[PDB]
Amino acid sequence: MEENTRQRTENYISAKNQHPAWILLATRRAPLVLSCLKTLFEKSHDGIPLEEAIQSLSSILIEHVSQEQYDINQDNPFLQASRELREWIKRRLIVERDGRIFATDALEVAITFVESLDNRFMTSTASRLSTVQREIENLETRLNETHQAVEHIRDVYNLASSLRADFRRVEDSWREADRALRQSIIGEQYHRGDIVERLLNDQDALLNTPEGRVFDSFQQQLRQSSELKAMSERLRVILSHPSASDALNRLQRHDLRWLVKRLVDESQTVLQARARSERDVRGFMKTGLAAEHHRVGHLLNEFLNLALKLDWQRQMIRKQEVPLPAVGVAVTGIPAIERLRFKEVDDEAEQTLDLSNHAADLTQIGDDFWDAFNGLDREVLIQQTLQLLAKENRPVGLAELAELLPPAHDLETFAVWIGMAREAGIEVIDSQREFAELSDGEGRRWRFNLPTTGLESQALMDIDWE
C-alpha cells in the first residue's frame, strides 16, 4: 500500500525539524562544532568544564575568521562561542550539569555518520593513479492471545481514561488559587508586589504535583509533535485487531480512536481556569485608591473583612434586619374601592365543529392541466420506427415515415427522427430540401420543409437507445 509513504514522508519532514542532529548537520557551522565537541568529549565521559569548551571553540573560531561562510567576527570571539554552545545546549543536544557539558545519544549518531564518509567517491575508474594511491595505503599501515487481549486492552483504556480526570484536578487547583487570591485582595495589607509575585509563585507551585507535572509535560508535546502522531497511529493499529471488538463496547472504541482530539479540546478548559487569576492582578494595578474613592473602598473592604467572621448559613440569622436608611421608597397600590371590578361578560358558544369529508371536484379545472396530461410520448414512437423500418428493409426518408405514421403532435417526431439519425451514424444533409404535408386538430394543413435523408433499419437496430 502507498499509504505507508504518506506517513513516511510526514515522518521525514517532521524529523527535519525538532530532532537536533539533522538540524545540526544542516547549519553552516556544523563542521567546526562537530570537530570541537568530538575532540573535547574524546577524552572525558564525566563532564568537561563549560569555560574550557568555550575557550577551545573560540580558539577554533578565530583561526577560520577569514572565511565569509561562517560570519565570525574578530571583535568578540568569546561571546560568539559562548552563545553558540549555549544555543546548542538548549536544544537538548547536550545537557549541562555541575558546570560541565555531557554527551548524549543524538551527538553519538551525528558523529557515527560523519566518520563513515569514505571520500573514495567519484571513482578513479581503476586508472593507474588509484592503484598507486592504494598501494601507498597498504605500505603506510604496514609500518604501524484472546484471553489476555481483552484484559490488556481494557487496562490500556483504564490508563488513557484516567488522564481526563487529572486535568479537572488541575482546574481545581487554579480555581482554588483564584479564590484565595481574591480573598487576600479583599485584605487591606498587601503591596502591589505581593499580588504580582504570588501569581508567579502559583505558576511555579503547580510544577510539583504529579498532576501538574503531567500537564506541563504534555504542553511541550504539541510543540515537538514527535509522539502525538505515534499515539494515535498505534491506537489505530490496536483497534484494527479483530478481538478488540469483544474487549470494548462500540462507544468506547469510537472514543479511544480520537483520544488526542478530546485531550486537546479538554485542555482548553484549564487555560481559562488559570486565566481568571491572570486577569485579577490587572484589576489592582490601575485603580489605585484615591480621592473619596480611596476611603469609600477602604470602608467597603473593612465591612467585607468583618463580615467574614459571621456564620452565614442560617436563613433566620440571615433574615436579621440592617439599620440602612429607607430611600427610594415605593408608594403605590392604594386600596380604593373603585379599584375593584367584576368579570363583565357571560357569553358562551362552541367553535362549531365541521368534519364534513370534503374532496376535490375533478370536473372543475381546464385544459392547461389536461393537455399536459396528454403529453406526447417519445417511447412508443421509438419502437414503431424499428417496427416499420424492419419491414421496409431499406433507407426510408423522413417524409415517407411521417406520411406512414402521421402524428398529431408533430414537431417532436421529426426532431426525434433527426436526432436518431445522428446517433446511428446515418448522415443527414441540410442542402437538399424536400417537402411534405400534414394537418392538425382543426384541419389546417401544414407544409413542412425538411432535410434530405433516408433511414435504414440496420444502423438504428444496431445502435443502442437509452
Partner: protein
C-alpha cells in the same frame, strides 16, 4: 489543501515563532514573534467576511 496568501503568511510566522524559542536571550525575540503572530489573529476577527 487550500492555497491562499494569509495562510502562507501564517506558515512563515509560525516557523519564525519556533525559531525564537531557542536563541539565547532574556526573552525578547520570543516576545517579538508571539506579538506579530497575534497581530494577524486580531486582524482576521475585524474583517471576518473576506
Amino acid at each position: 489543501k487550500v492555497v491562499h496568501e494569509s495562510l502562507r503568511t501564517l506558515e512563515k510566522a509560525q516557523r519564525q515563532l519556533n525559531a525564537a524559542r531557542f536563541v539565547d536571550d532574556n526573552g525578547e525575540s520570543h516576545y517579538k514573534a508571539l506579538q506579530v503572530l497575534v497581530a494577524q489573529l486580531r486582524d482576521a476577527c475585524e474583517r471576518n467576511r473576506t
